Design a binder for this molecule. Structure first.
Ligand SMILES: *Cc1cc2c(cc1C)nc1c(=O)[nH]c(=O)nc-1n2C[C@H](O)[C@H](O)[C@H](O)COP(=O)(O)OP(=O)(O)OC[C@H]1O[C@@H](n2cnc3c(N)ncnc32)[C@H](O)[C@@H]1O
Ligand SMILES: Nc1nc2c(c(=O)[nH]1)N[C@@H](CNc1ccc(C(=O)N[C@@H](CCC(=O)O)C(=O)O)cc1)CN2
Length: 823
């Protein structure tokens, strides 16, 4: 049976594609067609070791893991197929004090999630895994009720479920070409016939890049090699009544599990030693590859084999049955690309899975929800397909994938920095000027200063779970901005120009704030139909009907995609241009900001003439700039929008003009300190698709009664009338040597009641500041709670925000006070 017309065509029949097909149809979508080149599981899926753990070091990916595991538990009763899901639990091993710290870090990040997770003692570990060498074990990170699954049986079960709900799965039926239509639908060609599809989804494993090239896209993926070793029966293992838990020996860099009555273990060897398929990127995947392995290579993993033999002694006497060497499809940062793709209509991807077996279930549900409802069910911008860009070259991808492979089990510190592939091409002249003067941070391809070196203080990367070498420098930079004037490179912003006949009306319906009048700027949010915060933008009305929109580097294409889809879906006639890479931006902030800049322009920068949030085009020392009086520091300041080629010159002229004022640099770490004191929310931390703007405390920017029927308007009215269950608040807390950064558990009377979203040290009050979600009944100023940082609870107090009033507020207070006193 062939369907010539489909609602959705899924390309690829690995666990990921089949999971998506199952979910879409289970949720009621008719005419789902999956096309598979040869047979189900023919890519990476069939050879996988099948490890499926509740553990993830991130945040919302925990939900993907959780959803997969709960699904895999249900599949047998649903389909009649046994999936071979072994659930003995999983233990990550710590042998160093720093790894014990990593576990404590991970615990505070996990106690506000449903994920059941514990730090356990050597005694408990030996009881669970009695064939373990306890020599050097200090602790374990334990998730009960997870383990490993048969990837073949799992896929078959999902296929059976899919067919039950009406999915047509066709194989062999390789997609050979894909052509878009003007109405946004698709023509799909296979040797078995063609399909007209309303949408297409790429889930083609290590052919994902070949599939994307069919529609003119270059997906940044590369197949890496990975090996596990399987042993024959081991008498001691056979003799066990209970199945052994899955282990990860982190110091040894391998995982290990029971396989029948023997053992299976997989190393992640070093960057220098690991192999990857650069030839497949250069020349394509070889035709006829399929259900196939690479030649085994025991030699390159020797160190980890020897490590395993000392850690689990019985491996010394065991024989090797098999060594499985097979391809895994990696993206640069190890995480998949999951979602709708910018720049092409109705094309979705689920590609680049480093851990597809654990992810397939949860991602299938997530992506099904997004397709069916028009918004992500929860925030997973860390998987966004369009976090990558033109800077993500094949060279970059190869180096970064090699790094992500080798770093599989290194200690994960906060404020982690990785250096492979850097710097990319995404830099101005300012990079060369500043690079030796500061610690450059990586953000969506850009190099952005985090903090600036001080003479006689350590300039090295020194990652830590506690305060480290940038602590004093950051305080210096805070003082610089508060007392004098600082310059910061803000060039990484996403930047879009919107004009054309319907520009105002498009923005008016996308955005929850009013649209600013010509010559003015405001802060405005793009909400989802359910009233979630998809984006926070700064909107500048530069000339009649022509706007500049500014967003964070991490949200550039995520936000552009949403805008472009709304425009075409709504029949709006506009011109949208992504000028992100055309422009640099310098922030000049602090009480001397006006004095310095006034020396360089005929434009009147006085308080009464150049008002807060005005935007004007002018010249700074003959360099054309668009200047907005605004600053995320909350001090007096202008953001100076200019051509990238002029960045180095503009910076030089400002720094020379500010010498008398003691002008100096500041970076993003100090910026975070400053914005937190002002209680400024950050998209991605305080709000995202998980939050409505009312619980986030963004109501000042929300105009529920503006005429335009903006997206999310009705949902938000309902939310407001019903009343909030939680609220974002600001906490202060004394600590000894560690500051909150967000994602930490908040406790009250022995129970977890919320979480921090961001944090800093406040140098002005000499204690820590954090934003946090807490129940509304526990959200009053003066309320006491506790924040869990590295295995210790610190008393915290809700404060009246902001800690420090902004410059415009202070200026208004003085102006009003003088007027009143003059009576
Ligand atoms: C190699 C490996 C991988 C692995 C592992 C151990 C080894 C040695 N252990 C794992 C583990 O313990 N836990 C885990 O979660 N993952 C583990 N993996 C990784 C796993 O194998 C992969 O992440 C996963 O299999 C990826 O699945 P996905 O569905 O994304 O991709 P696929 O299985 O490669 O399937 C792609 C399908 O697409 C078909 N195809 C290709 N081209 C076309 C066209 N043109 N038209 C239609 N279909 C197409 C392929 O035939 C394939 O079936
Ligand atoms: N250009 C500009 N655009 C941006 C950012 C920026 O850094 N500058 N940063 C991103 C972060 N969001 C905000 C949020 C608040 C403020 C801010 O400045 N708040 C004033 C708003 C003034 C008002 O409207 O009353 C306040 O007092 O709350 C600035 C950027 C988004 N776009």
């Amino acid at each position: 049976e062939w369907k010539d017309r489909a609602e959705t065509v899924i390309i690829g029949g690995g666990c990921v594609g089949v999971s998506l097909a199952y979910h879409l149809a289970k949720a009621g979508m008719r005419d789902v067609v999956l096309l598979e080149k040869s047979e189900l599981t023919a890519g990476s899926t069939w050879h996988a070791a099948g490890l499926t753990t509740y553990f993830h070091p991130g945040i919302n990916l925990k939900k993907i893991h959780y959803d997969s595991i709960k699904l895999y538990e249900r599949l047998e009763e649903e389909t009649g197929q046994v999936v071979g899901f072994h659930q003995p639990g999983s233990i990550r091993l710590a042998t160093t004090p720093e790894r014990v710290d990593e576990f404590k870090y991970q615990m505070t990040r996990t106690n506000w999630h449903a994920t059941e997770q514990y730090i356990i003692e050597p005694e408990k570990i030996h009881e669970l895994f009695p064939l373990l060498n306890m020599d050097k074990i200090l602790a374990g990170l334990y998730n009960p009720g997870d383990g490993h699954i048969d990837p073949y049986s799992l896929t078959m079960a999902l296929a059976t479920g899919a067919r039950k709900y009406g999915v047509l799965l066709k194989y062999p039926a390789p997609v050979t070409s894909l052509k878009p239509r003007p109405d946004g639908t698709w023509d799909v060609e296979t040797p078995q016939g063609s399909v007209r599809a309303n949408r297409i989804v790429n889930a083609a494993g290590f052919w994902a890049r070949e599939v994307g090239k069919m529609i003119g896209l270059d997906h940044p993926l590369i197949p890496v090699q990975h090996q596990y070793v399987v042993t024959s029966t081991i008498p001691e293992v056979k003799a066990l009544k209970r199945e052994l838990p899955v282990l990860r020996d982190l110091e040894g860099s391998y995982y290990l599990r029971q396989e029948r009555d023997g053992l299976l273990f997989g190393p992640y060897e070093s960057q220098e030693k690991m192999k990857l398929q650069a030839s497949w990127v250069a020349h394509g995947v070889p035709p006829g590859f399929g259900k196939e392995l690479f030649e085994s290579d025991l030699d390159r993993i020797t160190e980890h084999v020897e490590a395993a033999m000392e850690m689990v002694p019985v491996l010394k006497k065991a024989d090797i049955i098999n060594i499985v060497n097979g391809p895994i499809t990696y993206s640069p940062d190890i995480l998949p690309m999951v979602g709708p793709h910018q720049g092409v209509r109705n094309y979705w991807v689920a590609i680049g899975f480093g851990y597809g077996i654990i992810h397939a279930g949860g991602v299938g549900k997530y992506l099904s929800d997004w397709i069916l409802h028009g918004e992500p069910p929860f925030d997973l911008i860390e998987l966004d397909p369009n976090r990558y860009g033109k800077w993500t070259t094949t060279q970059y991808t190869e180096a970064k994938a090699r790094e992500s492979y080798g770093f599989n089990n290194i200690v994960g510190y906060p404020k982690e920095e990785r250096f492979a592939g850097r710097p990319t091409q995404r830099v101005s002249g300012l990079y060369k000027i500043l690079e030796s003067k500061c610690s450059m941070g990586f953000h969506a391809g850009w190099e952005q200063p985090h903090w600036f070196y001080k003479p006689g203080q350590d300039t090295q990367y020194r990652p830590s779970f506690r305060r480290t070498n940038w602590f004093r420098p950051v305080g210096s930079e805070y003082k610089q901005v508060m007392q004098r004037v600082g310059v910061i490179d803000l060039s990484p912003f996403g930047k879009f120009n919107i004009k054309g006949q319907d520009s105002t009306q498009l923005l008016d319906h996308l955005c929850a704030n009013v649209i600013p009048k010509v010559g003015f700027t405001n802060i405005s949010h793009m909400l989802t139909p359910r009233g979630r915060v998809y984006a926070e933008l700064t909107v500048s009305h530069q000339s009649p009907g022509e706007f500049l929109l500014i967003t964070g580097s991490g949200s550039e294409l995520h936000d552009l995609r949403w805008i472009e889809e709304a425009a075409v879906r709504g029949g709006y006639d506009v011109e949208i241009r992504n000028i992100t890479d055309e422009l640099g931006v310098l922030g000049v902030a602090g009480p001397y900001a006006r004095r310095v800049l006034q020396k360089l322009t005929s434009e009147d920068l006085s308080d009464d003439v150049f008002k807060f949030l005005q935007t004007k085009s002018l010249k700074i020392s003959d360099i054309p700039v668009t200047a907005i009086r605004i600053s995320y520091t909350g001090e007096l300041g202008w953001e100076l929008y200019h051509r990238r080629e002029d960045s180095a010159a503009l910076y030089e002229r400002i720094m020379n003009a500010g010498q008398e004022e003691g002008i100096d640099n500041f970076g993003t770490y100090a910026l975070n300190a400053l914005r937190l004191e002002k209680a400024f929310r950050a998209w991605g931390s305080e709000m995202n698709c998980d939050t409505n703007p009312l619980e986030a405390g963004l109501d000042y920017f929300i105009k529920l009664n503006k005429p335009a029927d903006f997206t999310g308007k009705q949902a938000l009215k309902q939310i407001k009338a019903k009343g909030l269950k939680r609220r974002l608040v600001c906490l202060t807390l004394a600590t000894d040597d560690v500051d909150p950064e967000g994602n930490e558990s908040v406790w009250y009377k022995g129970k977890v009641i919320g979480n921090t979203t961001s944090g800093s040290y406040s140098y002005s009050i000499q204690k820590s500041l954090a934003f946090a979600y807490v129940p509304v009944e526990l959200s009053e100023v003066g309320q006491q709670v506790e924040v869990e940082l590295l295995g210790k609870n610190y008393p915290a107090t809700i404060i009246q925000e902001p800690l420090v009033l902004t410059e415009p507020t202070r200026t208004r207070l003085q102006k009003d006070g003088r007027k009143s006193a003059a009576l």
